[PDB]
Amino acid sequence: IVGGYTCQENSVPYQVSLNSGYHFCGGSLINDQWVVSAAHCYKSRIQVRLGEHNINVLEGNEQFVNAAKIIKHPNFDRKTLNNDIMLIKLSSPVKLNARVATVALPSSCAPAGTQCLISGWGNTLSSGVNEPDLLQCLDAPLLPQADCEASYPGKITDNMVCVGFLEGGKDSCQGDCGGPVVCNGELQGIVSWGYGCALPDNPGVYTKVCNYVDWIQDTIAAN
Ligand SMILES: [Ca+2]
């Protein structure tokens, strides 16, 4: 998260860190045994880290659970990032509490101008890399589809939405991939891609979760 603020400890209880020896992506807990992330975050084994604030210090509220099934959307395209969405079924259900909680799926697609919360332990710099120890948050609004298309001609499909600021300075970045964009209590976006990080005229692009509520429910049901 570039240009954000440190989240209060455990105030974004659905945020998880995907770890394979180091933090590499975010995700969001949607039920006691499943997390939603981005397909670009796929790995053969993943440990899901819930209840975290400092990812390098054990502060007392972590729950670490291995991923049992890792399911990328069947039409994910690694080159255009269309359908960048993946579900992770945990090897056991987590203990839900005030610091480890679910976030709701969208009941409708959100309109341009809705204010949202984006979070993660991704790079916090617009040039080079800095990996933060503490979870970072960013308040940012969904942008009109026409601004998103004009910023990345021919690359935005109907399963993508831009969120952020055309002036640059505040954005998500690598390592926040797969994490949440929550608006008014529902998960509307998943960190996906962007040109650079926090650059003017290059807002963050996110998977539009309101297009996959059926796929999510169905998958959960079959697995
Ligand atoms: Ca910790």
Q: Report domain extents, the chain.
A: 1-12+103-210, 13-102+211-220
Q: Mark 96-109 as b/e (b = at least 16 C-beta within 10 Å).
A: eeebbbbbebbeee
Measured CA distances, 120 to 16, 23, 91, 153, 185 (Å): 8, 10, 23, 27, 17
- Distance between CA 71 and CA 57 in Å, rounded? 30
Alpha-carbon span 18 to 102, nearest angstrom: 16
CB 135 within 8 A of CB 6: yes
Q: How far is the CA of 18 from the centre of ligand 1 (A)?
A: 13
User: Could you identify the residue written with the tokens 């203990």?
Assistant: 95
For residue 206, report the phi and psi dihedrals to the nearest 5 degrees.
Answer: -135, 150
Q: Domain 1-12+103-210 adopts which CATH fold? A: Thrombin, subunit H (2.40.10)
Residue 196's CB is within 10 A of a number of other CB atoms, namely 14
| Residue 153 CA to ligand 1 centre (angstroms) | 40
E strand segments, the chain = 5-6, 15-19, 23-31, 34-37, 47-50, 63-72, 86-90, 115-120, 136-141, 160-163, 180-183, 186-193, 204-208
Q: Please say whether the beta carbons of 50 and 94 come within 8 A.
A: yes
Q: What is the Å distance from ligand 1's center to 198 Cα?
A: 27
Residue 134 Cα to ligand 1 midpoint, Å, equals 9
Instruction: Give ion ligand 1 contacts, CB < 5 A.
Output: 52, 54, 59
* Residue 152 tokens, joined: 């990345």
Write out 95-115 in H/E/C secondary structure: CCECCECCCECCCCCCCCCCE
CA neighbours closer than 13 Å in the CB half-sphere of residue 223? 17
22 C-alpha to ligand 1 centroid (Å): 12
Fold classification of 13-102+211-220 is: Thrombin, subunit H (2.40.10)
Q: Is 146 exposed, middle or buried (0-12, 13-18, 19+ CB in 10 A)?
A: exposed
21 half-sphere exposure, CB direction, 13 A CA radius: 3
Distance from C-alpha of 37 to C-alpha of 153, rounded to nearest angstrom: 25
**How far is 133 from 53, CA to CA, in rounded Å?**
8
CA of 89 from ligand 1 middle (Å) equals 22
What token pair was written down for 139? Answer: 């308040």
- The answer to whether the CB of 7 falls within 8 A of the CB of 130 is no
Residue 40 CA, ligand 1 centroid: distance in Å? 24
- Extract the tokens encoding 13: 């209880």
Closest CA to 112 of 156, 61, 146, 68: 146
Whose tokens are 């440990």? That residue is: 47
Cα 49 to averaged position of ligand 1 atoms, centre (Å): 9
Distance from the alpha carbon of residue 55 to the mean position of ligand 1, in angstroms? 4
CA distances from 122 to 55, 72, 147, 156, 191 (A): 12, 21, 25, 23, 10
Cα of 51 from ligand 1 centre, angstroms: 8
Resolution, Å (one decimal): 1.6
Cα(8) to centroid of ligand 1, in Å? Answer: 13
Residue 155 exposed, middle or buried by CB count within 10 Å (0-12, 13-18, 19+): middle
Q: How far is the CA of 133 from the centre of ligand 1 (A)?
A: 9
Amino acid at 1: I
C-beta atoms surrounding 166 within 10 Å:
13
